[PDB]
Ligand binder design. Structure first.
Ligand SMILES: O=C(O)[C@@](O)(COP(=O)(O)O)[C@H](O)[C@H](O)COP(=O)(O)O
Ligand SMILES: O=C(O)[C@@](O)(COP(=O)(O)O)[C@H](O)[C@H](O)COP(=O)(O)O
Ligand SMILES: [Mg+2]
Ligand SMILES: [Mg+2]
Ligand SMILES: [Mg+2]
Ligand SMILES: [Mg+2]
Ligand SMILES: [Mg+2]
Lengths: 457, 457, 117, 117
């Protein structure tokens, strides 16, 4: 046990100098919960496997503090002086501190970060989002309703032309948003430049035919940084402003890719695809961090949007509690975790305008105009994975909002009447939800929705 | 179940067009192993939760193939046409395919990659290492023995000057190698530029006093790529060539940072620190991929070295089996995984010179000069975590080689007589091992080793 | 100072009258505040107090004399946040405002950096 | 009296986060030495002539501390968290904190900095 990291009940951890975190910890045979907590606090801040002999009073003043313990639920509260984190809003460094070596410690059998708190003084040091769902809505000229999008399937194997065709068919069917599948890139059979050019041409045709703008999120994840920047610059040169978003495989490409795109292209929607996060977040893995934590850090890094899950309605792991908590972490000015209440404002909570905005948000009013110096911009939850027209309404009911992007892959492209019909089916299912008519009743005179009922049941 | 992805016994999977992988898979109750295998192969190549209606004959020719099943051990062999992977040797794209969304599938309760195979035709497409341990040996003018290094502790909180002092004390005590702790960067109290200048001055003093060269591995993990490049360029401007290495938090910063440093500074040792890998690799996490896999991909990306574990001797989770297998994956020309035999050569196995080199390696001879067009350069295992002078000999005995870097934090800086004494103690423990004298007997007239024995027992 | 001596020296160039023209207030004194505490606010908190003072009818805000580029109150962010706060006040009231920035620095190049920014 | 700046005997002043200073202080008639010390510590760090209502817990953690008093010799030992000083090694900013407004307070009759750590 390293007692130098144990200060149970210390009231100074709430003074704005500390980022707080809750771990579910369980050490090997012989270690108590507080012992495991002291060792984790040591390995996630200033120490190592034994008391550090070269420590100075200063470095000891920057120690992480285990300040609360719950033995029954194997919970531990640790406080991190965020001064120890790399400056310049380095988020990968935060994850290195709190989600780094502690996951490999042989003496820790369970190590799951369940919640984290960012004090306003800490929020000051980080980017936060810059282009929001509201900006995309402005470009698309669609208000209030969810943004309806698709993932082009198959995940890999189409040529650039076939890919642009599926884009055209989806948009032309009333769809608003198309994203690359996360691994689609510069494969020889699907040249990336030609993919961009064909997407542009297809978008021009849809805009001509319908008078409506559309949006495509391009995957720019690459081998190195030079290639990603090359792809992004090409897209900028080929697509009209607001008509394109930048998708990054955040987990496998890394937080640095996210922050770099956020800072280099602040006026472009940054689409944080989280392929691989399961190893961190899945309930079955006792070591890692949960999806709410991932989402809060993705907002901290500045992602315009991140996938937050379908609350168990689709095919990816999750329940209404965690996934809806994630969507609220992304959207709300005041969001509640399992253990910390978060206000996404760099201003003291006592401010009258802030409390007013919080009250107005509880009443349904927008806080986005509250002041660039006063809020962390909202981030967009992206709802994907096993969705089809039959499930969108259930999701809307579960999350309690319509401020999000849904993306459907096989839920659109496997529709018996084709992609265009699949997009029409999702729009008709949304109308069914909006008019409070059952999908069976509404589909009586909607052929596309009726076929979606046939295939997806 | 998606039958289009099951081709058990397909003899075309060994023809060099496919990267092979073994998963330990467990689906939810009601799903058979081949069912879970079909769904995993679908979500990791061309498909989704249901057969894709927009699929083409071409794209179906690029499907992943489940070609072998082991019901008893819940094992599944999948073949991925590496043509579907992003070009330019993109490793993050591979990891998105095979270790991405499949980790979030609600219907899969266990999904652990246990081994992977690279055919020569695939190896051609990737960087592999460029700066090796042999290059560092040349610079340090130390042959045969392990490279002895330290991690400066405390993990955070020292000023740039105090940090340089500990560097000086370790080097002056006979240590060869000093690395940043993984989160140390540009904290306000430890300015990065001043830290670099002080390291150069300390190194100059050691070289003056000893006539010996030294190496310091700097952490360049940053918020964005421009800051990392700024740090790298500064270090190049302040340190003599060969005297510095670049450390990157591969997991939290991302594979793109790794590949970018490899390609932009190929003549500098790339130190892949794997802070955070545990959530993927720990035995307790049923979802992820193992350490041998992580290491093989780190060699694919071109890391000069990666942490491979202490075989259970230290404090990080691991056994002799997996950790020694990882070190051999990093070092050898012919390395054995749990399920695949890997030859790190882009040349046909039948080649006489290649088989000769494999035999000569079995006899203890170096293959590094075999030809730049026919080998993937060797990668260096880095041995860290809870190590102290008492354990180094046991590690050398377990791994069966000396081509590695050991790094010790508290094993040096918590030594009762200080850092310089700790470095001398590790050197004396190595001398004890080399002469087949027990540490107990050797410490009789070696004061530093004697105090290390008393403190670390 | 005799008149022949005064010729050799600068004298002021920007006066209170120039600021009056910008502020569009005549006769009455210019009412301003020093953001307090003297040190310890983040750039956001600092801009919040600037907004609150201007919105209440104040014309002029000045840095406290030691406020600068402390790590917890980034100078560049402080400037941007003050700009946005002033923008909001101007939209809500239709009145212009003034902020006096402390450019006192360690050396001359840093002061010029701050001023140009 | 601004009591928030009085923490006599605080042992955390020796942890390296603070620059230390000794003043010879004498306030006007009616103010004790610890009174003059409270006002000087306030005006040389985070406060003013009265408690700052807009202060945050963060900002109060950066308060200067009068941690020692010598009544007989009119001496006061104050600790300044050097994190409040402008970065880039700004020395004029230190002198602005500790040798600035405190020299103009009407209520301080003697205010002499004698040593610093
Ligand atoms: O590859 C896929 O499965 C998807 O394209 C969905 O396809 P379908 O519409 O065919 O289901 C999305 O990337 C996942 O939803 C991501 O998971 P998450 O949202 O949890 O990040
Ligand atoms: O932070 C640490 O624990 C270390 O600096 C070791 O310090 P000590 O010498 O004080 O133990 C290493 O980074 C870890 O060993 C990395 O783990 P791995 O090698 O498994 O990647
Ligand atoms: Mg996808
Ligand atoms: Mg370390
Ligand atoms: Mg030959
Ligand atoms: Mg206010
Ligand atoms: Mg003042």
């Amino acid at each position: 046990m390293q007692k130098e990291y144990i200060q149970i009940g210390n009231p100074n951890v709430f003074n704005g100098q500390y980022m707080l975190a809750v771990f579910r910890l369980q050490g090997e045979e012989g270690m108590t919960l507080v012992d495991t907590a002291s060792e984790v606090a040591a390995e996630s801040s200033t120490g190592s496997f034994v008391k550090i002999g070269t420590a100075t009073a200063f470095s000891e003043s920057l120690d992480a503090l285990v300040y609360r313990i719950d033995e029954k639920n194997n919970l531990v509260w640790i406080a991190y002086p965020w001064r120890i984190f790399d400056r310049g809003g380095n988020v990968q460094n935060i994850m290195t501190f709190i989600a780094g070596n502690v996951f490999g410690m042989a003496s820790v059998k369970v190590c799951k970060i369940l919640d984290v708190y960012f004090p306003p003084q800490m929020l000051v040091q980080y980017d936060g989002p810059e282009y929001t769902i509201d900006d995309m809505r402005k470009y698309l000229n669609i208000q209030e309703r969810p943004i309806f999008g698709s993932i082009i399937k198959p995940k890999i194997g189409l040529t650039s032309s076939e890919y642009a065709e599926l884009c055209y068919d989806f948009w032309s069917g009333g769809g608003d948003f198309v994203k690359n599948d996360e691994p689609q890139a510069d494969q020889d059979f699907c040249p990336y430049d030609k993919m961009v050019q064909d997407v542009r041409h297809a978008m021009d045709r849809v805009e001509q035919e319908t008078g409506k703008t559309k949006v495509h999120s391009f995957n720019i994840s690459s081998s190195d940084y030079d290639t990603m920047i090359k792809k992004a610059d090409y897209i900028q040169s080929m697509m009209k402003p607001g008509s394109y978003a930048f998708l990054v495989d955040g987990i496998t490409a890394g937080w640095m890719a996210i922050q770099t795109i956020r800072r280099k292209y602040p006026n472009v929607f940054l689409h944080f695809h989280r392929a691989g996060h399961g190893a961190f977040t899945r309930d079955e893995n006792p070591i890692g961090y949960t999806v709410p934590v991932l989402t809060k850090f993705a907002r901290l890094a500045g992602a315009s949007g991140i996938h937050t899950g379908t609350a168990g309605i689709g095919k990816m792991a999750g329940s209404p509690k965690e996934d809806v908590m994630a969507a609220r972490h992304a959207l709300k000015l005041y969001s509640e975790g399992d253990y910390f209440k978060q206000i996404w404002s760099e201003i003291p909570e006592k401010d009258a305008d802030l409390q007013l905005a919080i009250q107005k948000e509880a009443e349904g009013e927008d806080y986005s105009n509250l002041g660039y110096w006063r809020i962390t911009k909202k981030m967009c939850p992206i709802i994907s994975g096993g969705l089809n027209p039959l499930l969108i309404g259930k999701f809307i009911d579960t999350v309690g909002t319509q401020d999000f992007i849904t993306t459907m892959g096989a839920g659109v492209h496997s529709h018996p009447m084709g992609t265009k019909a699949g997009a029409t089916a999702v729009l008709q299912a949304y109308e069914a939800w909006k008019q409070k008519i059952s999908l069976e009743d509404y589909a009586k005179d909607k052929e596309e929705l009726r076929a979606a009922i046939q295939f997806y049941d």
